[PDB]
Design a protein around this ligand. Structure first.
Ligand SMILES: O=C(O)CNC(=O)c1nc(Cl)c2ccccc2c1O
Ligand SMILES: [Zn+2]
Length: 447
């Protein structure tokens, strides 16, 4: 009555190394020994420094339609202006000193910790490039270099902390008997295609895997028959997911007994995920506006269907992918940096102008001498956007009010911003668009 595994291998197993070579050869390990002790010291002090200053936060994430606080605490450090979205939650970088950077005030050591993980970034990048080089050499032996450079060009690291003591609510691994999970089976999302990932692991201080020691687990996608690998991690071990590993396999993190930090360096796919990018989108939308002076008499250059559609889509993007994402996190990074404070003021102001634009379009649609054909063209151009705007607003209000969110501290409690009451003359349109959307449809049905 024995079947395909339902089991896992560790180094305690003879088959371990050969299974590693045959079924997970794009997973690479570099033991703590291969990293200079000086770098170890700076990186671990930087972990503890960011921990004492309270810079790591559990994210109020979303999964299969459920609001869930993560057991693990996190901070995103990386290129200025860059974001990384996972589980419907866009993390904004705490900036690190990339060349030609602006020294935006931060707590004393905080900036020095960010500088440190930049240093670790450079290092791991060198290692990753070396390993992909070696990997290709094997490839050509048995059977571009710009591709390598870019698949290793880490623009962010996502730091994680868990204390299994003060966070004892951990799920059991369901397929292979690997025990307690800090992070369940997953692929890392929103990374550049075929990009590598590098993880520096930092633990503080018989059948199957040792439950007291931290491991990273690996399995093949769709496959619980091939035995999973449970890799032991100690103080300063590094692992690397190369090439298509992250796509073809899943990984998890198995909890040990002691606290542990990790630094997971990534090539975030940020083509719609940078400040410069969303600023350019806002400028594009506002091209349709007469911009001599900034005031409330917003007047539009064209009502061509395509230009209005584009404008209302950009309105949506800045509102929900940026403003609401930033403020849903209650301004926690204000604890680490001020970098995003002016950028978010400026995006909020660009957004307010856009509430202005929408209003202008709604006045036009209701205009006396407007041939009903052109009117119908406008409605059909904008209706999808306005309806998606209304639904996404209902969802963010709720997500800000969930019973789980109200239980967060005052430093991290969500902020449903921007938000205004119906008795607010400062804003040209109501927050609740259901009336407006209904009317627009009733018209499009009109004989
Ligand atoms: O800490 C580690 O060794 C590895 N960390 C992660 O692999 C990791 N990556 C992602 Cl994208 C998520 C995403 C959501 C929750 C946990 C994650 C996680 O632990
Ligand atoms: Zn992961």
């Amino acid at each position: 009555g024995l079947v395909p595994r339902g089991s896992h291998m560790t180094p305690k197993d003879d088959e371990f190394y050969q299974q590693w070579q045959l079924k997970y050869p794009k997973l690479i390990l570099r033991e703590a020994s291969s990293v200079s002790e000086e770098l170890h010291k700076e990186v671990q002090e930087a972990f503890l420094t960011l921990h004492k200053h309270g810079c790591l936060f559990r994210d109020l994430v979303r999964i299969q339609g459920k609001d869930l606080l993560t057991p693990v605490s996190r901070i995103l450090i990386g290129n200025p202006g860059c974001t990384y979205k996972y589980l419907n939650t866009r993390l904004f970088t705490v900036p690190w000193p990339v060349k030609g950077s602006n020294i935006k005030h931060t707590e004393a050591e905080i900036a020095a910790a960010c500088e440190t993980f930049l240093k670790l970034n450079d290092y791991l990048q060198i290692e990753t490039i070396q390993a992909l080089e070696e990997l290709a050499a094997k490839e050509k032996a048995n059977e571009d270099e710009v591709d390598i450079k870019s698949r290793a060009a880490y623009n962010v690291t996502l730091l994680n902390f868990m204390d299994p003591q003060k966070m004892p609510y951990l799920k059991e691994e369901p397929y292979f008997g690997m025990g307690k999970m800090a992070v369940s089976w997953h692929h890392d999302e929103n990374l550049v295609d075929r990009s590598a990932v590098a993880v520096y692991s930092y633990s503080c201080e018989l059948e199957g895997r040792d439950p007291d020691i931290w491991h990273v687990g690996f399995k093949i996608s769709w496959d619980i028959e091939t035995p999973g690998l449970a890799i032991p991690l100690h103080q300063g071990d590094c692992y690397f997911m190369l090439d298509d590993l992250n796509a073809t396999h899943q990984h998890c993190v198995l909890a040990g007994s002691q606290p542990r930090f990790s630094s997971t360096h990534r090539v975030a796919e940020c083509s719609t995920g940078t400040l410069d990018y969303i600023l350019q989108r806002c400028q594009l939308a506002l091209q349709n506006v007469c911009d001599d002076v900034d005031n409330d008499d917003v007047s539009l250059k064209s009502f061509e269907p395509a230009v209005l559609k584009q404008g209302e889509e950009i309105h949506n993007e800045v509102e929900f992918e940026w403003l609401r994402q930033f403020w849903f996190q209650g301004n926690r990074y204000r604890k680490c940096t001020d970098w995003w404070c002016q950028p978010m003021a400026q995006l909020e102001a660009l957004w307010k102008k856009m509430e202005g634009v929408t209003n202008a379009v709604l006045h036009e649609v209701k205009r006396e001498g407007l041939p009903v054909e052109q009117r119908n063209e406008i409605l059909t151009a904008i209706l999808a956007s306005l309806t998606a705007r209304q639904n996404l607003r209902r969802e963010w209000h709720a997500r800000c009010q969930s019973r789980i969110a109200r239980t967060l501290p005052a430093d991290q409690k969500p902020e449903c911003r921007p938000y205004w009451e119906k008795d607010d003359a400062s804003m040209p349109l109501p927050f609740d668009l259901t009336d407006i959307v209904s009317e627009l449809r009733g018209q499009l049905l009109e004989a």
